[PDB]
Ligand SMILES: Nc1ncnc2c1ncn2[C@@H]1O[C@H](COP(=O)(O)OP(=O)(O)OP(=O)(O)O)[C@@H](O)[C@H]1O
């Protein structure tokens with residue numbers, strides 16, 4: 125259905141910071157190419 | 163026999179200060195024109211099984227009250243948490259200065275625009 | 287003897303196979319887990335080799351090789367380990383054909399001396415007295431480090447610091463011990479202060495004056511736990527609860543809790559010496575200063591500002607503020623990387639391009655010199671040129687391009703052109719390195735060639751191992 | 756077009772990313788070239804079927 | 805908050821819950837399903853002869 129008629133709305137800062145934090149978290153794990161344990 | 167947490171919203175309504183002790187460290191005074199607020203009208207409204215005290219047109223309160231009159235304690239306790247859950251839905255939306263239609267409407271529109279943007283760049 | 291020769295090569299090849307992915311600003315990150323069970327996420331090549339905990343003597347010599355580059359140059363730690371391991375890879379093909387290692391060692395020195403004169407003529411000489419060329423070269427290497435937004439402001443702080451201690455275009459060797467950087471919580475990096483004297487992060491507690499003019503400072507080592515012989519020389523500043531009361535009556539500033547590493551720094555600022563006892567404490571061991579006070583700044587905190595040494599000595603100190611504690615420890619290394627890059631130009635007033643640029647002309651011109659040589663200098667020097675191409679082959683891997691087709695296209699660009707062509711890791715492609723503002727000093731490449739050749743000569747000279755109790 | 760870049764020894768991802776970008780602009784007869792290591796109009800180069 | 809997995813790959817996703825409530829206060833698990841599906845699609849790119857450096861620079865522009 126249309127969200128304008130149903131009134132289902134979300135803030136912009138919960139949508140912007142979700143796409144900002146998820147790509148920076150996916151960048152850090154993708155930069156791992158070697159494992160060292162002690 | 164007024165509750166303490168109810169009095170913190172009353173003193174915040176009329177802008178008055180809560181006085182803990184009446185003794186001003188050497189004697190006894192009432193602290194005139196300091197712990198008093200302003201209002202318009204206080205009516206003792208006849209409500210069934212609890213005669214309430216309503217306050218109108220205080221200094222800076224902006225709050226109100228909803229009297230959930232019902233039949234028993236089963237339908238009144240479930241309707242109070244329904245009003246509290248419906249309050250936080252409208253509250254968290256109308257704060258942040260602009261909103262976006264969510265619930266799957268954001269990511270479905272981004273799946274088509276970012277694919278057409280991907281065919282415009284190239285370069286691995 | 288072949289079982290020990292190949293064991294030193296394959297152990298050193300395993301070290302270079304791990305550190306090579308962390309090459310460049312676009313290098314791959316590493317996951318280090320210590321023995322206690324914790325995890326640490328960092329990509330600095332000098333940090334990984336410190337936490338490698340190797341046990342072979344060939345791999346332990348590469349640990350000392352990594353610390354040998356930071357003391358003379360202070361830049362390019364991981365670039366030395368890759369060319370050291372890839373040289374033994376090319377030496378493995380030569381050792382199968384029947385060549386003694388003592389002939390490859392002397393031929394690598396002739397490849398080293400020919401590699402210096404190739405890098406000498408291809409370099410661009412710069413002027414040391416011009417502070418503008420010292421400013422843009424220091425902010426270039428700082429843009430690839432952690433602190434990258436303050437590189438345009440921290441670079442003149444390092445240029446003006448070396449001009450007060452070292453005379454321009456006259457001295458060769460610069461000792462980095464007499465320079466100090468301080469840091470405190472609160473404030474910003476945008477506000478700076480260059481103190482010609484000394485600064486301590488301690489307090490004047492609980493001396494309730496904190497302001498003394500015409501001050502003579504005596505460093506006391508005998509712990510007060512007596513005050514009349516201190517007043518016999520008229521001392522007003524001492525540098526180290528019942529002792530606090532009598533010292534306030536004699537009106538002397540009391541500053542304690544000083545590290546022994548900071549004691550040598552005070553010995554060069556004013557010219558004072560640490561005393562041993564009270565009877566030895568006389569006026570011949572003190573100094574002279576016109577200002578000694580504690581200024582309560584908004585961001586720098588409560589710092590001791592002492593200026594006016596009026597004594598022979600070449601000291602200057604930089605006061606740095608900053609909000610977080612994790613920022614100021616990286617900001618201290620940001621100026622330290624800017625302090626070391628100026629130290630590379632005062633010994634060699636020249637600059638070269640970066641991003642795999644000089645390794646192409648080092649691999650192509652050494653091959654042309656190998657065609658005219660004879661003996662073992664036609665094969666081992668040609669293998670020395672083949673191992674110089676592992677740096678643009680790894681830089682093409684970390685940039686996201688083809689590791690073979692990028693170096694092959696770079697060899698044709700350097701055959702007709704010059705050192706301007708190279709790999710740009712910011713835009714991800716072959717372009718002019720001098721136009722995208724990427725430069726490196728001369729000693730980051732000419733000492734990396736010398737230290738890696740001396741390590742291979744030390745490795746190939748090892749024939750057998752022996753246990754000793 | 757991907758196995759045509761694999762059997763010719765070319766970069767299979769560098770050509771195919773530029774080939775789809777050429778079709779997105781309006782190129783209707785652009786494909787891979789067996790001689791040159793780039794894309795070309797196969798209708799102009801008489802590569803027909 | 806109560807999920808305790810002793811693995812460094814899972815320990816990366818533990819800290820983004822602390823960056824979510826301190827920034828806005830909501831959103832938390834929508835970051836987790838997006839970033840994990842970002843890693844699963846990028847893992848297919850590693851098998852398809854793509855270096856992750858083009859994946860990292862392509863994700864920031866996306
Ligand atoms: N801006 C740049 N563009 C392209 N390549 C670069 C750039 N900066 C550095 N490099 C390359 O990266 C290599 C250095 O790798 P890395 O930055 O991982 O170590 P480092 O930080 O220089 O170590 P140290 O500071 O201890 O010398 C150099 O050989 C150089 O060729």
Ligand SMILES: Nc1ncnc2c1ncn2[C@@H]1O[C@H](COP(=O)(O)OP(=O)(O)OP(=O)(O)O)[C@@H](O)[C@H]1O
Pocket residue numbers: 132133264265266824829830831832833834835
């Ligand atoms: N009124 C609504 N109608 C339809 N879908 C909704 C509505 N409100 C929220 N959603 C969906 O529910 C999801 C939220 O899930 P949930 O509340 O269980 O966890 P979360 O809030 O995402 O976690 P976190 O608190 O970290 O962000 C959102 O992805 C959103 O798409």
